[PDB]
Design a protein around this ligand. Structure first.
Ligand SMILES: Nc1ncnc2c1ncn2[C@@H]1O[C@H](CSCCCCNCc2cccc(-c3ccc(Cl)cc3)c2)[C@@H](O)[C@H]1O
Ligand SMILES: [K+]
Ligand SMILES: [K+]
Length: 545
DNA sequence: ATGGGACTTTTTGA
DNA sequence: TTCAAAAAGTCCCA
């Protein structure tokens, strides 16, 4: 329900928004945490504000009402005019209310804490500074009634498989004063994900993004499987609009290495570079100049993309794998006619250039005509999960029989020579499938269009796609998920661009040698690495890198 | 107990 | 009718 941001990050975000505030010019700054919780950020905002007022108390006393601006009145002034908080949890608000009160009855000091849905509250005024950590809820874990509200009221950033924190970005931007500064920590995925395209467009066209701190797959929150970034933006009048990008280099480092986050950012554990916000396309390609030069060379040289030459499709989605997937040595497969059985592989079975021998079998239950002819299969294998199967969406609507696969796709797409790759991996692993392998959605497949078979072969494609060049090339724009894991999904894999030049024959021949060695009984993996090194040199020569 | 590594389902909107 | 996206991942062990 409540997640605690590390103190080093909270202090960095508060200092990011307030360290250059001119309290003399504006002694009434409105600082808001829209998901304040117990007050991780607001309590630190109090301390920073208190030092700001006390350090200039005599200048304020001289410039303004001398009786009002006293050290004894700082506590009341902060709570009345400066600190604002909102959270849906009553108990967190009550705890934060006590913590703010205990920072110092005389007369009923009013604290601007609201217990509400920040996405529904009618905010009466805008704010100078906004900080905090919004909630993250995906499309599966969000209520259907609430999602209808979000789709209707937040359609500028929320669509399809978008996340809840997209709307908080929109709300924070909307209620930020002109010239104000916002700084939040959110998941990093919107920086590259397809769902975040509208959100990226909304941020780019409404605020100046001062800084992006990208932690990639490092674990910022303990015992939480999320990858985080810090976004700092303003609504100031500026003409340069360049972004400071801090991208981590070592994902295993501990965040408490230094007393402050800015020490870590300046260190060798991070890299810094600048991106012109006016040059951002629908995609935000945030890489240094060497990588940008590398990426642009490959883009310009290559004339084809995988989408042009290939047909992509996602694997089987049974809707209940335990009901339809069995070990190939399971005795219950004696009850199933071999015409119903398909080879079944997982992502771990995909290597470079080849697929491991399958150990599981899929019951393609869609080919079972009626319940009477194959009652034994239904009663003894599939029916053990009938209650769970009946709860699938297409079963409740009558589109699918209780024993059918939820998304059985087309058999002919799988029962052919094709290339398969895992949906999440640390490296490029594209394999030729010779054995008509089926898979779940953790493996993606594609086959070459007929009109392009004379230009590109499967052996050539796996040669370049598994090379170190294309491993680096794909990861420049790929979606970073967690420690040493990128998404390998068609929405980016099919955008990979490929080339064809005088090195085609030698590259294809080297790949065939690698494939031949990998399929032998006594595999000498040593020569495979040497052949791969030779191929990488050819590809680098081909692409002029 | 916590931190780190291998591995990855099916619900869901369109 | 039927596609493909989505980690506040999930789980195990030292
Ligand atoms: N709409 C909101 N408006 C304002 N504040 C808001 C709004 N949502 C959230 N918060 C605040 O964000 C603040 C910080 S982010 C964290 C909020 C995530 C809430 N979802 C996650 C979630 C959804 C469903 C069930 C559960 C759940 C229940 C019980 C158990 Cl054992 C385990 C899990 C959790 C928090 O203190 C929140 O009170
Ligand atoms: K005065
Ligand atoms: K992480």
């Amino acid at each position: 329900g409540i997640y605690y941001t590390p103190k080093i990050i909270v202090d960095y975000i508060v200092k990011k928004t307030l360290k250059n505030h001119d309290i003399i010019k504006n002694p009434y700054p409105r600082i808001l945490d829209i998901s304040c919780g117990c007050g991780n950020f607001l309590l630190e905002v109090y301390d920073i504000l208190y030092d700001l007022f006390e350090e200039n108390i005599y200048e304020l006393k001289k410039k303004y009402d001398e009786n009002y601006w006293t050290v004894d009145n700082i506590h009341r002034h902060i709570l009345n005019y400066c600190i604002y908080g909102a959270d849906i949890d009553e108990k967190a608000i009550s705890i934060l209310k006590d913590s703010l009160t205990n920072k110092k009855d005389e007369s009923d000091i009013k604290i601007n804490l609201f217990c509400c849905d920040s996405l529904k509250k009618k905010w009466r005024y805008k704010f100078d500074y906004i900080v905090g950590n919004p909630p993250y809820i995906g499309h599966k874990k969000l209520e259907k009634k609430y999602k209808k509200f979000l789709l209707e009221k937040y359609s500028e950033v929320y669509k399809d498989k978008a996340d809840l924190y997209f709307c908080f970005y929109k709300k924070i931007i909307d209620i930020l004063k002109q010239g104000g500064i916002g700084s939040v920590i959110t998941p990093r995925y919107f920086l590259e994900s397809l769902s975040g395209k509208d959100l990226r467009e909304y941020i780019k066209s409404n605020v100046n993004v001062q800084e992006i701190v990208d932690f990639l797959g490092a674990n910022i929150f303990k015992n939480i499987g999320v990858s985080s970034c810090i976004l700092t933006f303003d609504k100031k009048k500026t003409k340069e609009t360049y972004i400071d990008v801090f991208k981590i280099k070592n994902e295993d480092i501990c965040i408490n290495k230094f007393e402050t986050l800015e020490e870590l950012l300046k260190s060798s554990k991070f890299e810094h570079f600048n991106i012109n916000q006016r040059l951002l396309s629908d995609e935000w390609i945030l890489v240094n100049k060497d990588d940008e030069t590398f990426y642009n060379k490959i883009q310009e040289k290559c004339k084809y993309s995988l989408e042009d030459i290939a047909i992509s499709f996602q694997g089987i989605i049974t809707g209940c794998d335990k009901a339809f997937i069995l070990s190939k040595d399971d005795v219950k497969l004696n009850l199933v006619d071999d015409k119903f059985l398909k080879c079944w592989i997982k992502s771990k079975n995909i290597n470079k250039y080849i697929v491991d021998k399958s150990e599981y079998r899929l019951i393609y239950s869609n080919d079972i005509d009626n319940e009477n002819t194959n009652k034994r299969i239904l009663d003894e294998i599939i029916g053990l999960y009938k209650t769970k199967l009946e709860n699938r969406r297409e079963c409740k609507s009558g589109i699918r029989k209780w024993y059918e696969l939820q998304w059985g796709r087309e058999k002919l797409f799988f029962e052919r020579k094709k290339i398969m790759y895992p949906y999440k991996s640390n490296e490029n692993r594209f394999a030729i499938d010779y054995d008509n392998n089926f898979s779940s959605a953790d493996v993606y497949s594609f086959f070459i269009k007929e009109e392009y078979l004379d230009k590109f072969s499967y052996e050539y494609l796996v040669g370049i796609l598994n090379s170190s060049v294309y491993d680096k090339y794909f990861k420049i724009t790929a979606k970073k998920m967690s420690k040493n894991i990128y998404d390998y999904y068609p929405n980016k894999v099919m955008k990979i661009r490929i080339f064809r030049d005088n090195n085609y024959e030698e590259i294809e021949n080297l790949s065939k040698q690698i494939i031949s060695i990998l399929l032998n009984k006594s595999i000498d993996k040593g020569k495979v690495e040497k052949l791969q090194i030779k191929m990488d040199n050819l590809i680098m020569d081909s692409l002029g890198i």
